[PDB]
Amino acid sequence: KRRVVVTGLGMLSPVGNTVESTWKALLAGQSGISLIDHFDTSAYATKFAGLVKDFNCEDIISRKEQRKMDAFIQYGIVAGVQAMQDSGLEITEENATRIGAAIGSGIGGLGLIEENHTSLMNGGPRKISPFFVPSTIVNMVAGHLTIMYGLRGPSISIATAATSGVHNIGHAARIIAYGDADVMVAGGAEKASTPLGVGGFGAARALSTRNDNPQAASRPWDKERDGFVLGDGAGMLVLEEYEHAKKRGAKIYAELVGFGMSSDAYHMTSPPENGAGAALAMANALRDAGIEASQIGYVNAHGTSTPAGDKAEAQAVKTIFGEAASRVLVSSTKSMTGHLLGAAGAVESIYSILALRDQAVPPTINLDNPDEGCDLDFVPHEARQVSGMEYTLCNSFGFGGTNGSLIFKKI
Amino acid sequence: KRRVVVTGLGMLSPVGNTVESTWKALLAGQSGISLIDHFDTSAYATKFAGLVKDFNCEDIISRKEQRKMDAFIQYGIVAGVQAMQDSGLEITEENATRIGAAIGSGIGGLGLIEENHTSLMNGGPRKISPFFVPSTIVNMVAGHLTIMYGLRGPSISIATAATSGVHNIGHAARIIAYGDADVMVAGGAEKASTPLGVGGFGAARALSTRNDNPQAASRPWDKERDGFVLGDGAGMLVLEEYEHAKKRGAKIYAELVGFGMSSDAYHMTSPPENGAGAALAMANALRDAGIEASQIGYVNAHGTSTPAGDKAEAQAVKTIFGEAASRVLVSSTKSMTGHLLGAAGAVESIYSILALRDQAVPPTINLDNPDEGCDLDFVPHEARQVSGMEYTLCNSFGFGGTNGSLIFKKI
Ligand SMILES: C=C1C[C@@]23C=CC(=O)[C@@](C)(CCC(=O)Nc4c(O)ccc(C(=O)O)c4O)[C@H]2C[C@@H]1CC3
Numbered sequence A, B: 001k002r003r004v005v006v007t008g009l010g011m012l013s014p015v016g017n018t019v020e021s022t023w024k025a026l027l028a029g030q031s032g033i034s035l036i037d038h039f040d041t042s043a044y045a046t047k048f049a050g051l052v053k054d055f056n057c058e059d060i061i062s063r064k065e066q067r068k069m070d071a072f073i074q075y076g077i078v079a080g081v082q083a084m085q086d087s088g089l090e091i092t093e094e095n096a097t098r099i100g101a102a103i104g105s106g107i108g109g110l111g112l113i114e115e116n117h118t119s120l121m122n123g124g125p126r127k128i129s130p131f132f133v134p135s136t137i138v139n140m141v142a143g144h145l146t147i148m149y150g151l152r153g154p155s156i157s158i159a160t161a162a163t164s165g166v167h168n169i170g171h172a173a174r175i176i177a178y179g180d181a182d183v184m185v186a187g188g189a190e191k192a193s194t195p196l197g198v199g200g201f202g203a204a205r206a207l208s209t210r211n212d213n214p215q216a217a218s219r220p221w222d223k224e225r226d227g228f229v230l231g232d233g234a235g236m237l238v239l240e241e242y243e244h245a246k247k248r249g250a251k252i253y254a255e256l257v258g259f260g261m262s263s264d265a266y267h268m269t270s271p272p273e274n275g276a277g278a279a280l281a282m283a284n285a286l287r288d289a290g291i292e293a294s295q296i297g298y299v300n301a302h303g304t305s306t307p308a309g310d311k312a313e314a315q316a317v318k319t320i321f322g323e324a325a326s327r328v329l330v331s332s333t334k335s336m337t338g339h340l341l342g343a344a345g346a347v348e349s350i351y352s353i354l355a356l357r358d359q360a361v362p363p364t365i366n367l368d369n370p371d372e373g374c375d376l377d378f379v380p381h382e383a384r385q386v387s388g389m390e391y392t393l394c395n396s397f398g399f400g401g402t403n404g405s406l407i408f409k410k411i
């Protein structure tokens, strides 16, 4: 029976351009939200987001190649390289066939779709770039990374909106456990802070419009919350069959033990008050891991900072945790990072893994005045020290009612 | 050990709006390619495509709901309903939790992305539709269908360009076989015949420009081939654990026995001359099925009608089939249907299943003057009667070098 462990990490987030710098900022309660400057936000209801500061790929992606990729692909490649380098894995002719990728994105190449469509409108189809398609489509991060590293094993890309990162990580694990691969680079990348992303989610009345205090905007479970905050970035993990990791003397961050999925079957852009879908996904991950809810020490929530979304998950956590509900810690790191969409589940799985390593749990900042009837410990304001935490759980839910939960185990 | 069978089929294609009408047209060598009329093609190098004729969803999708969906979603829902109805499955409170969906698309909502971006350019973000995001993103077919049928089991959506349909079908099977579901509606949907789809693939020099004879344009393995022909549609299959199918007295079309994946690790938009990636995917599907290449009777090829793509797959088939290479039948139905992109692997899996049922193999039409050194039987011109064919294989490859092969077994 094949076990799957995590042997490499890579990340670009609004609070840091490496895994460790991002994690340091999160334990310190730092916000990565700021005012947008790369487009004129005068007419936008929302004028801020969690941006990647000073992104740099000069040494990683050639200049001939950069021109062929939307920003989300560039972020995903940089984070994937970070992970592959961290793993220390050496690809060979013998290996290549057993190493793959499961990387996606919720929305993909908004920036270059806008650029190409602007060009088409202005000068006709003659002005569309030859790179239009391969520069925007969701699966292009997996495609570039396999080519860059010579990976010939399975490559897939799951695009399930905000659930993408968890699904891609979960299915990469399944692929290894099934026997179709020994190693997979898995995760998600997103750069939706563009006129269409900001204007589009704004049109749906889904974004916070607290322009006068961008850093207080994302405030999960707080009574004054008014929608999510968009965040850009990428998170990647190298997953690897257990015996293969040891035999090569790999450093092992944690083991991936459970993966659960469900569908709300309720509404396209809102969860049911019940949180029944969220509950079933967590229940499925627990059964997959062979453990009880009481063994979970910390839940990194989907917690996007929407009025109805936050309430549904708190109900689902109550439902699954029952007695232990008040004893498990729950926190939403989107209070600092914003919502990375298709990359959220990927960076958040990293947070869930590091919490195990460091026995430290990042806070839900801005939780000044929690919803009433809430009995849960949302780790408000300040990080929390924990003791013998052996399991963490990461939730990620998405438009379409699609849900996913991952369970990591220490060592 | 859980076996997976196919118990329901649904389809919209350029040669028919049902499964049986489409299959009848294919065995008759009919082309579904025609001149585009829904947009001004004056400035386009390519002015034709395989369109869905007289699409109708009046009785299936409410008018309040249609306005919230790009065409690809509407096609996918109609084909999914066709499949669920064909399966005869009755969803219950007891069942709901064990039935899910794995449905994707290569490019998703081009038409509504263009509409929304046009609106933004013309009148600012105020003019973006509240439905922008949920009307365009790839996972929305799975989302609507789960809500429509009350499906609460796992839902994922794989977007791997032209490989999508095969990946989604293959992973739905894995999900059932793993034990996470007993039933899954799986497939793909695409409607990329828009200014961006036609202009975008045109910019890449990937499309045939034989405007003077649209029906002769798609001509896989023919010396005069000049690129692929874009096709719209959707293909859906209900996959189901074997014992569950029987117990309810389900009609069983075929069993899904093998699923293989690989990556070319070569170039973003072209396969290696070697066809090594294609070969590895087929090799992996055969090993997964536990059979030898000699047991395959018919290969429904990726065969898109590009100069380099068709040659690479013929090399890969030679490589895998060796001695039997000339004895296996290979055909590309894209010679009639055009390239359905993220739905190609889904409709083509249906063709591969029906070939088993009917012991009849559809032709590669337009194969007037085959590439030289080719020794393979590409079923040129006319359908072929077969005798004791027990296994069919369906290939689907995609930009990014991502490959997939499915193997179906009679009964
Ligand atoms: C349908 C309606 C009713 C409505 C009213 C109150 C709300 O809280 C929300 C804002 C957001 C619902 C939600 O969290 N969905 C929701 C969801 O189900 C799944 C995922 C996410 C995510 O961002 O990843 C998400 O955001 C909206 C969406 C919307 C307009 C007002």
Ligand SMILES: C=C1C[C@@]23C=CC(=O)[C@@](C)(CCC(=O)Nc4c(O)ccc(C(=O)O)c4O)[C@H]2C[C@@H]1CC3
Residues within 6 Å of the ligand: B162, B204, B205, B206, B227, B228, B268, B269, B270, B271, B304, B306, B307, B308, B309, B310, B339, B397, B398, B399, B400, B401
């Ligand atoms: C990179 C270059 C060189 C080039 C020259 C000859 C060719 O045949 C192709 C036309 C198409 C290659 C191809 O089939 N890729 C290709 C591929 O790898 C995977 C999938 C598909 C598909 O449609 O699903 C596909 O189409 C093109 C693409 C392009 C411009 C000319």
